[PDB]
Amino acid sequence: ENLSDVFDIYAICACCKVAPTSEGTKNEPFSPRTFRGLGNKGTLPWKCNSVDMKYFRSVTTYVDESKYEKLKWKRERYLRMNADKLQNVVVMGRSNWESIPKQYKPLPNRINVVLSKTLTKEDVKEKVFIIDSIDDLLLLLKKLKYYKCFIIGGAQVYRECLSRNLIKQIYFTRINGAYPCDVFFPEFDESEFRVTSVSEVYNSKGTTLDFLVYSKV
Numbered sequence: 001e002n003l004s005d006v007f008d009i010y011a012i013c014a015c016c017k018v019a020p021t022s023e024g025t026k027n028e029p030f031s032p033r034t035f036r037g038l039g040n041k042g043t044l045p046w047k048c049n050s051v052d053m054k055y056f057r058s059v060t061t062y063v064d065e066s067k068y069e070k071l072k073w074k075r076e077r078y079l080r081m082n083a084d085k086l087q088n089v090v091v092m093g094r095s096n097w098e099s100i101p102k103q104y105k106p107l108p109n110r111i112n113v114v115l116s117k118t119l120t121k122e123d124v125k126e127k128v129f130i131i132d133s134i135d136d137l138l139l140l141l142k143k144l145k146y147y148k149c150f151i152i153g154g155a156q157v158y159r160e161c162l163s164r165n166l167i168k169q170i171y172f173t174r175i176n177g178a179y180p181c182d183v184f185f186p187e188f189d190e191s192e193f194r195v196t197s198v199s200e201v202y203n204s205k206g207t208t209l210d211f212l213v214y215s216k217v
């Protein structure tokens with residue numbers, strides 16, 4: 001009855017502290033969420049961060065063949081009632097797909113999926129599934145051999161999956177720095193997600209950061 005568990009749908013993101021503004025109705029100097037800044041002008045708020053990229057890459061790439069068996073059965077039973085290299089699935093919005101550096105798209109060692117009702121195969125020469133909605137993602141997953149399904153961006157992609165309770169875990173990176181932002185991470189029922197992993201602190205050129213993991217418990 002839990003699709004996020006049956007199809008191992010997780011979410012991964014990186015958020016920073018929002019940089020204040022002296023004009024407008026959007027300045028929150030006492031926000032209860034110190035880390036809510038997701039993007040700024042179609043780009044990352046902090047630009048580049050070697051550690052986070054390394055972490056994100058590792059996480060969304062790692063596969064354990066010695067664990068797929070259990071997963072295959074879990075999905076077979078559900079479906080009831082192709083010798084393809086085992087890989088994870090990454091799901092992104094059109095913007096995110098259009099920002100990836102040419103030499104990184106499609107994401108290496110990963111099955112890429114882009115949510116869009118505008119793009120077409122004719123215009124994208126790279127291998128990647130294009131879907132109209134989350135419902136189509138579900139369909140795709142029901143008939144696709146993969147390890148885990150990672151949602152990597154952006155705002156609305158995250159917001160629809162949460163509200164539809166399709167998220168088993170959340171990989172949350174906390175960038176410790178203030179940056180101007182215009183896109184933020186959506187809010188969710190914190191109560192149904194308990195923090196199950198708290199990493200040590202890390203440093204990326206004076207900018208500290210850490211990695212958390214919440215599990216729908």
Ligand SMILES: NC(=O)C1=CN([C@@H]2O[C@H](COP(=O)(O)OP(=O)(O)OC[C@H]3O[C@@H](n4cnc5c(N)ncnc54)[C@H](OP(=O)(O)O)[C@@H]3O)[C@@H](O)[C@H]2O)C=CC1
Nearest residue numbers: 013014039042043044093094095096116117118153154156
């Ligand atoms: N720090 C982090 O971890 C992350 C940061 N970001 C940042 O976020 C900003 C991008 O934000 P945003 O424009 O929201 O990004 P998206 O990548 O979601 O692009 C929006 C577009 O994606 C499509 N889309 C989004 N949701 C859906 C949906 N539910 N169904 C179908 N299509 C959908 C639409 O395409 P169409 O119009 O073709 O239908 C849409 O107009 C950037 O600055 C990026 O760097 C993004 C992810 C993670």
Ligand SMILES: CCc1nc(N)nc(N)c1-c1ccc(Cl)cc1
Nearest residue numbers: 012013014053056096152153173
């Ligand atoms: C390395 C950035 C990064 N770090 C973390 N922690 N989570 C993410 N989801 C992304 C990310 C954002 C946009 C694209 Cl297009 C690909 C990945």
